[PDB]
Design an enzyme around this catalytic site. Structure first.
Site, mmCIF file in Angstrom:
data_model
loop_
_atom_site.group_PDB
_atom_site.id
_atom_site.type_symbol
_atom_site.label_atom_id
_atom_site.label_comp_id
_atom_site.label_asym_id
_atom_site.label_seq_id
_atom_site.Cartn_x
_atom_site.Cartn_y
_atom_site.Cartn_z
ATOM 1 N N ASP A 1 0.643 -1.240 -0.131
ATOM 2 C CA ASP A 1 0.319 -0.035 0.043
ATOM 3 C C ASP A 1 0.893 1.137 0.072
ATOM 4 O O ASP A 1 0.955 1.921 1.043
ATOM 5 C CB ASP A 1 -1.044 -0.144 1.098
ATOM 6 C CG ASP A 1 -1.983 1.007 1.214
ATOM 7 O OD1 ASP A 1 -2.028 1.852 0.218
ATOM 8 O OD2 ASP A 1 -2.660 1.185 2.344
ATOM 9 N N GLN B 1 -8.234 8.438 10.908
ATOM 10 C CA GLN B 1 -8.899 8.965 9.215
ATOM 11 C C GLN B 1 -8.313 10.243 8.943
ATOM 12 O O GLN B 1 -8.471 11.151 9.963
ATOM 13 C CB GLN B 1 -10.512 8.764 9.227
ATOM 14 C CG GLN B 1 -10.829 7.326 8.770
ATOM 15 C CD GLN B 1 -10.750 6.459 9.682
ATOM 16 O OE1 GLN B 1 -10.505 5.116 9.463
ATOM 17 N NE2 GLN B 1 -10.962 6.814 10.983
ATOM 18 N N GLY B 2 -7.758 10.440 7.856
ATOM 19 C CA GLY B 2 -6.815 11.801 7.506
ATOM 20 C C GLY B 2 -5.407 11.646 7.913
ATOM 21 O O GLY B 2 -4.710 12.604 7.292
ATOM 22 N N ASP B 3 -4.951 10.601 8.411
ATOM 23 C CA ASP B 3 -3.269 10.404 8.567
ATOM 24 C C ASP B 3 -2.651 9.487 7.407
ATOM 25 O O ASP B 3 -1.687 9.197 7.405
ATOM 26 C CB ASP B 3 -3.327 9.906 9.946
ATOM 27 C CG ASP B 3 -3.513 10.805 10.978
ATOM 28 O OD1 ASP B 3 -3.413 12.309 10.822
ATOM 29 O OD2 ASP B 3 -3.981 10.522 12.131
ATOM 30 N N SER B 4 -3.786 8.913 6.653
ATOM 31 C CA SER B 4 -3.362 8.113 5.672
ATOM 32 C C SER B 4 -2.071 8.634 4.765
ATOM 33 O O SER B 4 -2.051 9.574 4.344
ATOM 34 C CB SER B 4 -4.541 7.782 4.591
ATOM 35 O OG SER B 4 -5.221 6.532 5.165
#
Lengths: 224, 33
Positions: free
Chosen positions: A84, A177-180
């Site tokens: 990923d 969520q948002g740190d990806s």
């Protein structure tokens, strides 16, 4: 980021924020003047033209230097959550100097040792499911969780050798969520991973899952 | 609690039902809501 604190100017010279269609979306890591490393899922299936990057700022809305994308290279074997990582070539070359620098990378074939310390950073929510979106960068330090343990939490096939995990037994500290795509580093500030996936955020007995720079070093060197 | 192998979306993030019967979800910030 959950359970963390405000990051300081200079703690992660190479961290970038990545907006999509003018909104927050992912983080990344500047590898050189025209290369950002983020998560494959941040960019795969999407229009490359929607993405702007910001380097050299603790803020995701102002400061530093920005760039749109010239091209995107998703891992050839990106599958489900595995492998990923994506390489983003930048339309604007961002020189090192002042508040920006480039990420040094975890050694090829290295693997984060269980119990060792790691720090992740980003502009994601501060609580699981939270309506929060920080302007200024946040950071948390967490221990690496052995793959054997992570496999117990999630399942043997869910956690591969191209992933590693981090978190505290009783929860409280995690990316969210948002740190990806954003960096997780060792105490030399070596880039050992990028935020990827998890069961919620900071839950007890459910680690944060990271794409492994060591395990994926080949991909990175080739397209950087 | 989910059946392993199932898939869903929570907003812009894909979630997968892992062997241990829970949802693993990606960690994008989803904008247009």
């Amino acid at each position: 980021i959950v359970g963390g604190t405000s990051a300081s100017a200079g703690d992660f010279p190479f961290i970038v924020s990545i907006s999509r269609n003018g909104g927050p979306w992912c983080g990344g890591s500047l590898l050189n003047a025209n290369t950002v490393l983020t998560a494959a899922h941040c960019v795969s299936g999407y229009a490359q033209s929607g993405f702007q990057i910001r380097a050299g700022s603790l803020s995701r809305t102002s400061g530093g230097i920005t760039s749109s994308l010239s091209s995107v290279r998703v891992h050839p074997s990106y599958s489900g959550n595995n492998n990923d990582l994506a390489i983003l070539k930048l339309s604007t070359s961002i020189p090192s100097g002042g508040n920006i620098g480039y990420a040094r990378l975890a050694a090829s074939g290295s693997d984060p040792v269980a119990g060792s310390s790691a720090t992740v950073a980003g502009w994601g929510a501060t609580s699981e499911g939270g309506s929060s979106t920080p302007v200024n960068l946040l950071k948390v330090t967490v221990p690496i969780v052995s793959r054997a343990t992570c496999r117990a939490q999630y399942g043997t096939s869910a956690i591969t050798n191209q992933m590693f995990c981090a978190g505290v037994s009783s929860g409280g500290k995690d990316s969210c969520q948002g740190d990806s795509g954003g960096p997780i580093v060792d105490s030399s500030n070596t880039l050992i991973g990028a935020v990827s996936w998890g069961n919620g955020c900071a839950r007890p007995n459910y680690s944060g899952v990271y794409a492994s720079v060591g395990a994926l070093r080949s991909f990175i060197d080739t397209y950087a | 609690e989910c059946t392993p192998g199932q898939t869903k979306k929570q907003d812009c993030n894909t979630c997968t039902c892992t062997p241990t019967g829970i949802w693993g979800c990606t960690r994008k910030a989803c904008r247009t809501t």
